[PDB]
Amino acid sequence: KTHGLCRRCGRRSLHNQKKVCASCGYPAAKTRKYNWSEKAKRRKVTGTGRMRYLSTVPRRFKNGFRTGVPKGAR
Amino acid sequence: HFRKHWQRRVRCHFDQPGKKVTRRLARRAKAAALAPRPVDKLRPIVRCPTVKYNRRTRLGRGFTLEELKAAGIPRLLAPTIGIAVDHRRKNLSEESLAANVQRLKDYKARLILFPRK
Amino acid sequence: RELQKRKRRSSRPTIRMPNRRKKALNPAGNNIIAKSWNKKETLSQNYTRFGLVAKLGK
Amino acid sequence: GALKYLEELSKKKQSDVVRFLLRVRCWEYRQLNVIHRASRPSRPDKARRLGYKAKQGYVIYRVRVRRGGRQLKYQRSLRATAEERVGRRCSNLRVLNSYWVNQDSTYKYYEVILVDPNHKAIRRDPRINWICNPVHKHRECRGLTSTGKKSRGLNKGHRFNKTRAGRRKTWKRHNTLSLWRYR
Amino acid sequence: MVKWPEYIRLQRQKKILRMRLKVPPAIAQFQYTLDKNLAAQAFKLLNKYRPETKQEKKERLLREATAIKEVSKKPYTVKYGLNHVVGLIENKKASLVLIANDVDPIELVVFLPALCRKMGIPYAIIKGKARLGTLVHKKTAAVVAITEVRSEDKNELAKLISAVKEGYLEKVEDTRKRWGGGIMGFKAQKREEKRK
Amino acid sequence: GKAKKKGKSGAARNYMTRTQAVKKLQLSLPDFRKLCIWKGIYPREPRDRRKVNKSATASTTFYYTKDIQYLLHEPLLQKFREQK
Amino acid sequence: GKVKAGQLWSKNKEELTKILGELKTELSQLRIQKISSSGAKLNKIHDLRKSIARVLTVINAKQRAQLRLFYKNKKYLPLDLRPKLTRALRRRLSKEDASRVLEKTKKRLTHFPQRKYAVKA
RNA sequence: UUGACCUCGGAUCAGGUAGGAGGACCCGCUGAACUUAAGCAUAUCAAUAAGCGGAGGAAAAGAAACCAACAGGGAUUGCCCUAGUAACGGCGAGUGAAGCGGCAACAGCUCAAAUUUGAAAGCUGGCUUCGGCCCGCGUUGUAAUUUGGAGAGGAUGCUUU
RNA sequence: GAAUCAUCGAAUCUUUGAACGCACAUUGCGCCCGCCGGUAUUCCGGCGGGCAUGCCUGUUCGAGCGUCAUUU
């Protein structure tokens, strides 16, 4: 059991003796991302999750980030 | 000269008609805002510099401050009536001055100026 | 790429952006040029019919 | 016209009155912190010439940088290293410019002018509201200060051909194979 | 033994260094300020020509506004601001110049005694830039000047001009050119004898 | 099964000493006394002074928690800082 | 089972709190007796859950409208009541700040503005 | 004893800001080796890839300490040719621009150095019925005027809001 | 006024994560303010708002024979 569960990325890649995740580097503020492996980036880019907030931005820009209510609404 | 990676820095021009129609719609949109106004500005007649091109004139950047004064056109009104001004250029000869002053009087004759508000 | 594959699988609408341009292609108002401007003609034959000059260059 | 007198005195900086002041200030700056703050500029004529005003939103910071080589030489200037260290400290502020204030055998001392883009005096003033825009985030990291414009060769002439628009942009332009439709 | 705070030690060691290191005559002339009697007489005249504060200027403008609804001479105030004052002494409009001894960048006033002496205006050097800011209704004033006073006290300024000249100016005349330093104590003397 | 301390739980939460009330209010002693006259704050008596504070004396005076909290939110306390 | 949103906007805050009171209690007793013979009770439970969600939305809506009427004169609004926009749209210069110009450039533009003209053919 | 001014700190005081993501394009730092020369080390690869820092819808550059030698041109940027030219080199492999000219697009400006001195005229706060009150910043300089193919000051008489 | 409808300007938004009271592999361990229920001013449990770092402007508090004035 060299590696344990990582809090941030959820993989079993957190080294137990060093307390550093080999996939994302959890104690570091930045997520680990190297350019010599494109395949590892398409496993973690924006778009591989659920888009809880980023998916609702484009509709708000379509209407000019409108604030208020429709006129004569109840 | 195929010594470096030419494949990763090759630019193709399939958008040449696409850029052309975009360029024409930019000129179209420029005259939409400036509707009675022309789409360009007045440029002076300028003599090409080197001995290879001494005998051909072209369009320069803007008129000399002395060229505006001889034609009776004020310097702080000239950019507002569509005349480009260049303070770097000098006359150095009466032939360059007389040719461009005559150009400004011809622009003055063809001009329709509208009264403020 | 992983972005676009998520949208196809999702039951969320594709936000269709209307064709809005920064600059209007035609003059507008109640001036003389706006009333006599032809939408289908181009700049040069519009200024031909007006009697004006569009380009002062060569 | 007190600053014209200061300009002539700053030119003469090995002379007796100024070398005395540069000696006693270097002793004081050595025993302070590396990236400490200055309530007033030590050279008010150089701060004024570089864009500093006595307005809320303008601060001055003093930095000590280690001098010497990196026989490899660090292509970043010591002013550019000084400017990068203020911005990483005062991450809410924008690096306007910097100037030399002192020297030693181990350290060089610089004073850096910072502008607060989130104050209301700054946003109201159209002479400095340009720095409020998001294009000017971390100018010292992109070589956009006077030191960076020098080290990037941003001058005009036959003497600065390779670097007058950016050498990486010029190298991309000169190494691009341009193929047209009707070749 | 006990440990002093860092800024306490630094500002105290700046005392000892200023009194130990021997100072060039440009900065050394600031160590010779005037006496208690001449300060009080100068500030007696100068308090009479204080500028108007923000309250009584706003009321004075309110005077002329409400009278316009329902004739002045030249105001005479003490002049301040470095570039304003040194512009006045360069144009020989100043009668008397009073310079603080504690401008934290000393270069802003280090040319002032020579410029006043070249131009012919008699000057003086006083303790406290805070004392000059009191006259000015600011926090600190690096320098003040007097240009013209009313005819009530043309004589009082003339006697003060002389008293500054024969009481301060012809007493520091030899010390303008001479260097500072030479305040070595018993510990410094024994240390220098051990080093030599 | 949880371990709970007798010092932290009981009458010590309810009643507070005069010195602790002054330190909490961050006011001087004459300022605290004057605010007691105006607001009608009263020292009162706890049931067990030893349970309120183990190190305590009968000469010492205690205070209730709620009226101290009223003095913490007093506009007079804000007015005292403005007048000072 | 279902409470229409039309009548909820009429009633005040205290009367809504009674409906909120009976709604979960009826849900709770239903859920106890739903674990045996979960038939049309299960359709009713769904009607209870939507009705609870509908009155909570109406209770919240009149609450912040009352808060916004309180804060219509003060400068600093609370964090939840402020509009979202984006991060960069919030740090963008204001419309009055980005449009204002120097006095020396206003004096120039007043007396020498861009005139309107045409050139004959 | 009192009260400054200067400097250094504290506060779960009020109001804000920075981190991370993305990185196709953009600005910097740092920086290889394989290959070629039928071996190979200068060179080349390459001021590239990998590594680090930092922005925007574009970025960057930009209104000459410019190019020119002409009858001169006239901020920046990009395309076409210049041109595989000049120039540099185990002068082998090779490397390799620019001015001019034709176009695309064009737009100019802000300070510092001046005494408003017959009046700090400037600005942040937070308290308001909001109409205008104080606090602070600031003379070690905040507004106005001015930025060298200029300008200021007087006089002068027309023309502008 | 149906809808596994469309639009979308108002809300809700658990634990984490730049991740922010401390710990984290436990639905644990602390402090300030307020509320509720169960014998309840003392006991227990739950809930609500808060409590990271660097920096800027202001507010307030403090230190320094650094330093000025103080017999009219």
Ligand SMILES: [Zn+2]
């Ligand atoms: Zn991980």
